[PDB]
Design a protein around this ligand. Structure first.
Ligand code: 3PE
Ligand code: MWV
Ligand code: Y01
Ligand code: Y01
Ligand code: Y01
Ligand code: Y01
Ligand code: Y01
Ligand code: Y01
Ligand code: NAG
Ligand code: NAG
Ligand code: CA
Length: 1135
């Protein structure tokens, strides 16, 4: 109408959207300047000006909203309520109106001020790339309901098991005597705490419940040991971690399950529950790891990638001066180019040599050499300007890079007074980047990366918006509420606080990396309410689990003589290899010389080497060493066999030469390492495993260039780290650790001049520290020591130079991007290799899938035995009792049973047990009723062929077995072990499984996993092989590393040490999960108190190689498992 047409001009004007983004950015700025640390009641100017600004902006929001309704209409598909974001904007408008009205009513209620945060979420709808990407995200969201329901499973079963096993157990500390005698001046707390403020509790084991810590393992205090008086332990006190990690209710159980899903603090609660209840709960935790934290979030990745592919194809289907010439020849020679490549390489090498405590001559050598190289660069660029011409020289901008580099270099050389030696030296490092100019394959790799990041930029902006929203929200809820209590007289703010926006964003980023996030989780749950964990759960999910998988989807779719018998000798030698593995599994360094097992170990080694050399001789005389083609060593696996048998022989020889064992100890070490490497021939002796290893190796070459690029970035950033931090990673550790600046003051206090294990003195330790930093673990501490770093030889101060945060965050983003590129490259390469197959052979099954259709034509109607049932008093049973109208009733019964098991908790009222037992009796009754209805509905045939009625009968039979049990204890008929009752109660949970009948998506997804079982099972066998090999290496390398009070352990607490072989397996498993593994390195590399040669040996040269290789190989194997599952899912999706 005409009144509508009056306002059309402005609303359709793009200037209106631009100024709306202007006011959105103003809103982001206004939300930025909030200071919950200082903004008490807004009795300051800036608070008032921000109130004025956001009042004006709210006025603008109201006017623009009302105009755009009155110019577009209301309540219609075309009207204002057409897009979701318009409805959201109306929601902001109404919420702000309500909050303003309440403010006029003089009620603060800072819970509607928790809506101020949601305002920057308005930006998506008016940014086109963002709007499209977010629309695709939302449209592919509804197809994650299946992974959400399976997540409901993995939480619910494990949570019920947890709440029924360890209900309130975690509480029990070791108390004093009930009637204790003390003369006076009672400084003894009621129970025992090793650390102050219950930092590391000492959860006992109740009498009768066989834990491990039974109050007689307490550390003897070091007169008299008062601690021995902490005798009896009961279950009344606060729970571990300031009452945040316990199995009291089901909410806390779900929090614990969430914590172990994200792989942080895992070992701590693992050891807690071991201490409390039983030694055999690592079974529960390992099954939970394997099921949830690996086969689920990776299934979430698979679902995101696949469904994003289909929804993208969907909308796709919707729209569907004579010397000048002479001097040229010297340039384009490809030989002087090689010379200047050697020059640049040696420049990078020299420029990397510099380390801490430089020899005085050496730094002069480096500066002279830098002058020489700069003169050389000046030489060839003064050459190129004339021989080619100015326009020709600028025709390639790489020459412009070179000119800029030399100009900066010469300015630095001129800068011998001040200034230049601070930053221009740091900018010298770009000369390394000159390599891309002449290494050609990287040009293709870099341009591919650029074409990919053409899509990433919008997602990167989306990440900034998302992090901003949650940082502001956390600021609103947690601002000034992390006041960590004093330790020297004043309330020290925790470094992981929310008191200011810079720390808010860096802390949200920390949380997103799943690194020491449980610390702030507890520190937030201890302040407001146990509901504050919903914030971290929401952030973790809507970050890592639905958005970063969206990134991967974006990338992948952007890419888109003597007689011989050989019957079962392989089988028998494989068995012998298994026995060899068994005997490798016992060399833990406690066997005293001359032991019976020692002798058995040695003789077994002798015999097994004899058998291996015998089969060596057999298979060579069948072939011949090198005698023509198709000889022995034409296959690498046979080559490996020969290598390992030869090194075993020389091991035996040197062992027999034990006389005069001086100066051959290093030989003994290397031979022990190699015989630990020995159990690998299974790949040769196993066809499927061999094919798998070939797939691993062949799949690595395509991402070889990406690996080289990542190594180059590691090197360059290591040189950055050396340039910035040289010897600033020193801190005076002491009881005071205050009011002192330099090492002289520290030695005056005589505390210690501690030098960190992760530091940038040379380039090598810089590379190790960068590998840890890029590993998303222990990176917070490195970042802290970076920010706090001040200068060469004095105390770091809290947040001395915050700008290093930019370096430390840029490194994570770049390395994460390169690892993501590696993953997507593996996926696409495997896809192309796969793509040939379904082109090749799947053409042959499409001949038979319609044959199966012809098979179903036989199935039309074989006079099914429905006619037998009717008129036999079961005329309605066969039909009316088999309809969906009664199956949903069973589903509702099961939901009721679920909510009943969601109620048990510690100190539940008596009426609660009575009601729960009544509900269980009702539920088992109705289960028996439906079972009988089925039994009369059909005869014996469906009882077994259904493949479900057996499960139903098992469920009802366990239920009826259970109901008989408490009847025994009501009349005290017979003493029943409480363990039996506990087992019965905890396995009543199996009744949940019947939803799989109704949840067809669960069937589909789990089956899709199942058809990939061969490849992933072979990969799992390979993964166990890798664990075994690295376990043997660890046992022989780090066997003598003792853990005690004299040797403080940060990574290996009690069973994570390298003494025996089982503990080594556990600690390799812990390393493979990226939890405190950098702590394990910090422990293993340690200059000891000269008590053993292991600390003083060359361990520093080898242990980082050990852990780096293990982390890389384990992550690669898991990545390929994920790729196999994803590819099977795509194959099924095409079908
Ligand atoms: C050269 C190093 C380049 C990779 C940097 C190491 C790294 O990224 O480790 C961290 C990451 C763990 O990630 P997260 O589980 O979230 O904690 O772990 C990973 O994601 C590493 C995945 C990349 C795999 C590249 C391995 C190249 C060599 C594989 C040899 C396999 C032989 C069989
Ligand atoms: C190493 O870089 C990350 C990457 O590539 O993700 C992995 C697993 C990582 N993820 C399970 C959680 C993401 C952790 C994370 N959030 C961040 C936000 C900002 C900055 C850094 C961040 N770090 C790496 C290796 C791997 C191994 C597997 F067995 C299965 C999947 C994967 C991928 C996968 C999810 C694509
Ligand atoms: C795939 C999901 C749905 C099932 C996961 C199986 C676990 C829920 C069950 C299977 C074996 C059970 C374990 C069997 C043995 C023990 C030792 C037991 O120790 C004593 O009772 C003493 C404590 C329960 C526990 C850990 C059980 C914990 C729960 C477990 C891991
Ligand atoms: C491939 C090039 C461009 C990168 C540099 C190679 C580094 C891995 C190596 C080569 C020279 C090595 C340095 C040679 C000299 C020393 C002095 C050394 O101090 C001693 O006195 C012993 C500390 C190790 C360090 C820095 C070495 C660290 C590791 C370095 C830098
Ligand atoms: C949709 C789900 C997945 C994420 C939704 C995020 C928020 C809407 C949720 C998650 C965390 C919840 C918060 C967790 C902690 C708190 C602090 C709590 O504050 C207090 O106890 C003190 C009250 C006062 O000071 O008067 C009030 C509930 C609240 C705001 C909760 C409100 C709703 C929040 C912000
Ligand atoms: C390539 C990325 C993915 C990881 C890099 C792994 C290695 C190339 C790095 C990580 C650990 C580094 C080592 C860590 C410790 C040292 C410090 C330094 O040893 C010393 O302490 C010298 C003084 C002495 O102990 O005698 C020599 C370099 C070296 C071996 C480093 C050499 C380079 C290493 C093996
Ligand atoms: C299945 C893979 C992925 C993990 C391996 C689990 C177990 C085979 C490991 C982990 C915990 C280890 C146990 C940790 C503690 C001990 C006690 C200690 O001896 C007392 C060393 C053996 C043992 C039983 C270890 C035997 C081997 C165990 C059971
Ligand atoms: C199937 C393989 C690839 C993975 C699973 C292997 C482990 C579950 C097995 C194999 C080797 C076994 C270990 C071999 C050595 C020991 C012997 C034993 O320690 C002793 O020698 C006794 C000490 C003494 O008597 O003084 C403790 C059990 C343990 C860790 C065994 C625990 C169970 C282990 C780790
Ligand atoms: C540390 O320095 C401060 C500086 O004022 C001083 O007050 C204090 O006495 C010194 N000693 C200790 C133990 O704090
Ligand atoms: C070390 O710190 C003390 C304490 O202020 C100061 O007096 C001294 O000059 C500093 N430098 C030294 C001792 O070289
Ligand atoms: Ca950690």
């Amino acid at each position: 109408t005409s009144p509508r047409n009056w306002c059309i001009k402005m609303v359709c004007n793009p200037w209106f959207e631009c100024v709306s983004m202007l006011v959105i950015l103003l809103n982001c700025v206004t939300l930025g300047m909030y200071q919950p640390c200082d903004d008490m009641d807004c009795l300051s100017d800036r608070c008032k000006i921000l109130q004025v600004f956001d009042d004006f902006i709210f006025i603008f929001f109201a006017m623009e909203m009302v105009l755009k309704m009155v110019a577009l209409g209301i309540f219609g598909k075309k009207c204002y309520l057409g897009d979701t974001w318009n409805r959201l904007d109306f929601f902001i408008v109404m919420a702000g109106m309500v909050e303003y009205s309440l403010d006029l009513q003089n009620i603060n209620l800072s819970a509607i001020r928790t809506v101020r945060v949601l305002r920057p979420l308005k930006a998506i709808n008016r940014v086109p790339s963002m709007r499209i990407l977010v629309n695709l995200l939302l449209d592919t969201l509804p197809m994650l309901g299946n992974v959400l329901l399976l997540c409901f499973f993995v939480f619910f079963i494990f949570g019920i098991i947890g709440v029924q096993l360890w209900a309130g157990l975690l509480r029990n500390r070791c108390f004093l005597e009930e009637n204790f005698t003390i003369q006076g001046d009672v400084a003894l707390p009621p129970y025992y705490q090793p650390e102050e403020d219950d930092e590391m509790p000492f959860i006992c084991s109740l009498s009768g419940d066989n834990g491990i810590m039974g109050c007689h393992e307490i550390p003897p205090l070091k007169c008299v040991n008062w601690n021995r008086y902490y005798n009896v332990c009961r279950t009344g006190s606060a729970n571990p971690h300031k009452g945040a990690i316990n199995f009291d209710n089901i909410g806390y159980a779900w929090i614990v399950i969430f914590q172990v899903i994200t792989l942080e603090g895992w070992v701590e609660i693992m050891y807690y529950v071991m201490d409390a209840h039983s030694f055999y709960n690592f079974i529960y935790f390992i099954l939970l790891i394997i099921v949830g934290s690996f086969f689920m979030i990776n299934l979430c990745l698979v679902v995101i990638a696949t469904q994003f592919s289909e929804t993208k194809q969907r909308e796709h289907r919707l729209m569907l001066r004579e010397t000048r010439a002479k001097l040229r020849g010297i340039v384009d020679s490809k030989y002087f180019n090689r010379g200047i490549m050697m020059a640049i390489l040696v420049n990078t090498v020299s420029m990397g040599i510099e380390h801490h405590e430089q020899p005085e001559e050496l730094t002069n050598i480096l500066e002279i050499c830098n002058v020489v190289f700069t003169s050389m660069f000046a030489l060839e660029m003064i050459l190129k300007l004339a021989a080619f011409g100015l326009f020709d020289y600028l025709r390639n901008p790489y020459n412009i890079f070179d000119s800029i580099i030399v100009i900066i270099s010469i300015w630095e050389i001129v800068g011998q007074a001040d200034g230049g030696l601070s930053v221009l030296r740091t900018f010298r490092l770009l000369r390394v980047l000159k390599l891309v100019r002449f290494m050609p394959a990287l040009r293709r790799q870099l341009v591919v990366l650029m074409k990919t990041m053409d899509n990433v930029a919008t997602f990167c902006m989306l990440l900034m918006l998302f992090i901003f929203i949650f940082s502001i929200l956390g600021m609103h809820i947690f601002g000034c509420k992390f006041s960590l209590r004093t330790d020297t007289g004043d309330t020290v703010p925790d470094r992981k606080n929310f008191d200011s926006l810079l720390w808010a964003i860096v802390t949200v980023f920390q949380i997103l990396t799943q690194e020491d996030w449980n610390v702030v989780l507890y520190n937030g749950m201890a302040s407001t309410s146990p509901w504050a964990s919903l914030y971290f759960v929401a952030l973790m999910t809507f970050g890592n689990y639905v958005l970063f998988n969206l990134l991967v989807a974006i990338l992948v779719e952007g890419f888109q003589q003597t007689i011989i018998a050989h019957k079962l000798f392989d089988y028998v030698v494989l068995a012998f290899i298994f026995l060899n593995c068994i005997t490798i599994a016992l060399e833990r360094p406690q066997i005293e010389a001359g032991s019976t097992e020692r002798i058995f170990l040695t003789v077994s080694n002798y015999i097994f080497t004899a058998i291996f050399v015998g089969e060596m001789t057999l298979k060579v005389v069948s072939l011949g060493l090198y005698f023509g083609e198709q000889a022995y060593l034409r296959s690498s696996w046979n080559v490996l066999d020969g290598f390992l048998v030869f090194v075993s022989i020389i091991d035996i020889v040197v062992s027999l030469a034990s006389a005069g064992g001086a100066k051959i100890l290093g030989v003994l070490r290397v031979l022990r390492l190699l015989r630990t490497l020995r159990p690998l021939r299974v790949i040769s002796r196993a066809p499927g495993l061999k094919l798998v290893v070939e797939t691993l190796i062949s799949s690595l070459k395509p991402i070889g260039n990406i690996v080289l690029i990542c190594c180059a970035f590691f090197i360059i950033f290591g040189i950055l780290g050396v340039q910035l931090f040289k010897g600033k990673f020193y801190h005076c550790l002491g009881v005071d650790t205050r009011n002192i600046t330099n090492r002289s003051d520290c030695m005056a206090a005589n505390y210690r001049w501690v030098h960190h294990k992760y530091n940038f003195d040379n380039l090598g330790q810089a590379l190790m520290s960068l590998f840890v930093l890029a590993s998303k673990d222990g990176w917070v501490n490195i970042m802290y020591n970076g920010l706090d770093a001040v200068a060469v030889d004095q105390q770091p101060v809290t947040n001395h130079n915050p700008w290093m945060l930019l370096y430390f965050i840029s490194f994570l983003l770049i390395v994460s991007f390169f690892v993501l590129n590696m993953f997507v490259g593996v996926v696409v390469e495997n896809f192309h290799k796969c793509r040939q197959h379904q082109e090749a052979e799947e053409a042959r099954r499409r001949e038979e899938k319609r044959l199966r259709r012809l098979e179903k034509k036989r199935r039309k109607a074989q006079r099914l035995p429905y006619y037998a049932t009717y008129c036999h008093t079961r005329l309605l049973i066969h039909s009316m009792c088999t309809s969906h109208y009664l199956d949903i009733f069973i589903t509702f019964i099961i939901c009721l049973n679920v909510v009943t098991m969601s109620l048990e908790h510690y100190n539940q009222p008596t009426s609660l047990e009575t009601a729960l037992k009544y509900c269980n009796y009702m539920f088992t009754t109705v289960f028996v009723l439906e079972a009988v209805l089925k039994l009369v509905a059909f005869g014996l045939r469906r009882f077994f062929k259904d493949r479900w009625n057996q499960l139903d009968l098992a469920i009802v039979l366990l239920s009826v077995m259970g109901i008989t049990l408490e009847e025994i204890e009501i009349n005290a008929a017979l003493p029943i072990n409480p363990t039996i009752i506990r087992i019965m109660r905890v396995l009543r949970i199996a009744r949940v499984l019947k939803l799989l009948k109704m949840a067809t998506g669960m069937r589909a997804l789990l089956d899709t996993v199942v058809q990939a079982l061969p490849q992933v099972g072979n990969l799992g066998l390979l993964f166990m092989l890798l664990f075994f090999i690295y376990a043997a290496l660890g046992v022989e390398l780090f066997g003598k590393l003792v853990c005690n009070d004299e040797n403080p352990c940060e990574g290996m607490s009690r069973h994570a040490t390298f003494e025996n072989f089982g503990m080594a397996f556990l600690t390799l498993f812990q390393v493979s999960t990226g939890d405190n593994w950098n702590g394990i390195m910090k422990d293993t590399l340690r200059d000891c108190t000269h008590d053993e040669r292991s600390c003083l040996s060359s361990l520093q040269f080898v242990s980082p190689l050990y852990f780096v290789s293990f982390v890389l190989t384990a992550q690669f194997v898991l990545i390929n498992v994920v790729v196999a599952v994803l590819m099977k899912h795509l194959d099924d999706s095409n079908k």
